[PDB]
Each structure stands twice: as C-alpha cells, then as structure tokens.
Amino acid sequence: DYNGQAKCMLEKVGNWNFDIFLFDRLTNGNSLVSLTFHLFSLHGLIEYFHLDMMKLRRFLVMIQEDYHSQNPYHNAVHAADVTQAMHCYLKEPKLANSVTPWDILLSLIAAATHDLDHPGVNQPFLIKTNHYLATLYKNTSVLENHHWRSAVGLLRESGLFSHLPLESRQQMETQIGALILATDISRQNEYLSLFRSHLDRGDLCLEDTRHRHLVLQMALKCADICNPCRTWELSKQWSEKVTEEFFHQGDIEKKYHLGVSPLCDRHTESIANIQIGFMTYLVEPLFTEWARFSNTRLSQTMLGHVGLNKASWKGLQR
Ligand SMILES: C#Cc1csc2c(=O)n(CC)c(NC3CCCC3)nc12
Numbered sequence: 001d002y003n004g005q006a007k008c009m010l011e012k013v014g015n016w017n018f019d020i021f022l023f024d025r026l027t028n029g030n031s032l033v034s035l036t037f038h039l040f041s042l043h044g045l046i047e048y049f050h051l052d053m054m055k056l057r058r059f060l061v062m063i064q065e066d067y068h069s070q071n072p073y074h075n076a077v078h079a080a081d082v083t084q085a086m087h088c089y090l091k092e093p094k095l096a097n098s099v100t101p102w103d104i105l106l107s108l109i110a111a112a113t114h115d116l117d118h119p120g121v122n123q124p125f126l127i128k129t130n131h132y133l134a135t136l137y138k139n140t141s142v143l144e145n146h147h148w149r150s151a152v153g154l155l156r157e158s159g160l161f162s163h164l165p166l167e168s169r170q171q172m173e174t175q176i177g178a179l180i181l182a183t184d185i186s187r188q189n190e191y192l193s194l195f196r197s198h199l200d201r202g203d204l205c206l207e208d209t210r211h212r213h214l215v216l217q218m219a220l221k222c223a224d225i226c227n228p229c230r231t232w233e234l235s236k237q238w239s240e241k242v243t244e245e246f247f248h249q250g251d252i253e254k255k256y257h258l259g260v261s262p263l264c265d266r267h268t269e270s271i272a273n274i275q276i277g278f279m280t281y282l283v284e285p286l287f288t289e290w291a292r293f294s295n296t297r298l299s300q301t302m303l304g305h306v307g308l309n310k311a312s313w314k315g316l317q318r
C-alpha cells in the first residue's frame with residue numbers, strides 16, 4: 001500500500017493542493033529525494049543530460065540528509081515543498097514556453113538545496129553570537145551563501161555532472177547561487193522593486209537568459225513563501241511549524257540574554273498576528289507582482305488562499 005499510494009500521489013505532483021506532509025509520511029521521510037527524482041524524470045532531464053541514475057539518487061540523498069530534520073520548519077520537507085511549488089510555476093505558460101532543460105535542471109536543484117544545512121536560527125542571531133558563518137560571509141545573506149556553498153560542495157562531491165565541461169559546471173554553480181541568494185527575504189525590496197519596474201515597462205524578453213533568470217529568481221522567491229497561498233489545511237501546519245522554530249530561537253535569546261528577536265517572543269507574540277503581518281507586507285506584494293507577470297488561474301487561486309487564510313487568522317482573534 002505505502003509504495004502504492006506514494007507512486008500514486010506523484011501523478012498529481014502538478015497540483016497546487018498536493019499534500020507534501022502525507023507524501024513524506026508515506027515515504028518514511030524520503031519526500032525530497034523521491035519527489036525530486038520524479039521531477040528529473042518527468043521533465044526529461046535524465047535523458048537530456050545523460051545522467052547516471054545511481055549518481056542522481058546519491059546526490060539527492062546527500063542533499064536531503066544535510067537538512068536538519070529536528071528543525072520544526074527549515075528541514076527537507078520544506079525543501080520538497082518549495083521544489084514542488086517551483087514545479088507548478090515552471091508549468092505556467094510564459095515559463096513553460098521559454099525555459100530550456102538547463103533552466104529546469106538549475107531551478108529544481110536550487111529549490112531542493114536552497115535552505116541546505118539551515119541551523120534553525122536567522123541571520124541576526126548568527127551575527128550577534130559571532131557565528132563563524134557570519135564572519136565567513138561578512139554579515140551579508142549569511143544563510144543563503146551557506147546553503148549555496150554547501151550545494152556547490154554536494155554537486156562537486158556527487159560527480160553527477162562530471163561528464164559536462166568544467167565551464168558548464170562553474171556556470172551551473174553561479175546560476176544556482178543567484179537563484180538561492182534571491183531567497184534572502186531581508187532583501188525582497190530590491191528584488192521586488194526591480195521586478196515591478198520591469199513589469200511597469202513591459203520590457204521582459206523571456207528568450208533572453210538574463211530576463212528569464214530574473215523571473216526564475218522571482219518564481220523561487222514565490223515558492224519559498226507560498227505557504228499562505230496553499231489551502232488552509234496546509235498553510236495552518238506551515239504556520240505552526242514556522243512559529244514553533246521562531247519561538248525556539250526566542251527561548252534561547254531569552255535564556256542567554258541575547259535580546260529577543262522580532263517575531264520570536266512567545267510571551268508577547270501570537271501565531272495569528274505573525275501570519276497576518278507577513279501576509280500583508282511580504283506575501284501579498286510579491287504574489288500581486290507575480291500575478292501581473294503570470295496572469296493565470298494559478299495566480300488567482302494563490303491570491304484567493306492568502307485572503308481566505310488571512311480571514312481565518314483574524315477569525316481566531318476576538
Ligand atoms: C519575517 C517573517 C515571517 C513571519 S511569518 C513567516 C512565514 O510563515 N514564513 C514561511 C513562509 C516565512 N518564510 C521566510 C523565512 C526566511 C525566508 C522566507 N517568514 C515569515
């Protein structure tokens with residue numbers, strides 16, 4: 001049954017209401033490997049790039065296993081969710097009609113690896129505790145640079161692309177980095193303003209790689225914060241997990257006199273209030289610009305869920 005139903009759910013991997021939680025329970029925690037493998041084969045990538053399936057499984061397992069499963073939110077199930085969303089966005093017509101197999105490959109790798117080896121605490125925390133990552137990356141997109149360099153390390157170690165030219169391997173590394181770095185939420189204003197100006201001007205040319213990669217970066221940013229655009233029953237699980245992780249960082253800050261970060265204080269802060277502010281100020285602006293770019297049923301469905309989920313959180317107030 002368990003392998004039966006898993007295989008079965010993957011028939012609906014293009015669906016916005018895909019249930020990654022059930023999927024991960026069904027696979028005893030193998031959701032990122034098993035979904036991503038399926039997508040490589042669905043998008044034809046194993047053939048297009050002459051991939052060794054043994055090396056691909058090894059690669060995917062190294063990724064999945066380098067997530068910290070004890071993180072309430074930043075674990076391989078979140079990676080798998082982001083990868084599944086990225087897949088839905090790659091199916092939108094303006095992307096499906098311009099992306100090459102190389103773009104699809106880099107998008108799905110970047111989605112799978114984008115929070116790799118995440119410690120479960122944020123950049124301000126690592127900076128104020130003098131963590132070696134904050135030094136190494138000079139206080140700038142500390143976590144994203146760490147996920148990216150960790151991804152590069154796994155790419156090199158797996159040999160998966162060893163039969164491609166060195167210059168293609170290097171280019172793969174660099175374009176994945178630009179995708180992962182776009183997920184630094186502290187810089188969403190720079191990405192969103194540039195994207196919005198391109199949409200005002202109407203100047204995007206998707207047959208140009210640079211414009212297409214700007215859009216893929218915005219797609220990955222959507223994938224990363226699309227939790228509130230899911231159905232209530234998914235979004236509520238994501239909200240409890242993210243809050244659980246923030247609040248744990250809060251307890252450490254409190255216990256050790258570090259200063260409690262915004263959003264991490266379980267005594268003065270609420271799950272509903274945290275979601276509401278986030279939806280108003282980060283989610284709705286990004287998804288409104290996304291819907292201008294890709295003005296489709298999926299974009300409407302996603303914005304409908306934000307409005308409904310936001311009303312549910314208000315409802316659970318007074
Ligand atoms: C600031 C803030 C947030 C308040 S609620 C909330 C949330 O539910 N998520 C999950 C979508 C993220 N994702 C962020 C974490 C860092 C990158 C994306 N950020 C926040």
Ligand SMILES: [Mg+2]
Pocket residue numbers: 114115143183
């Ligand atoms: Mg991240």
Ligand SMILES: [Zn+2]
Pocket residue numbers: 078082114115183224
């Ligand atoms: Zn993420």
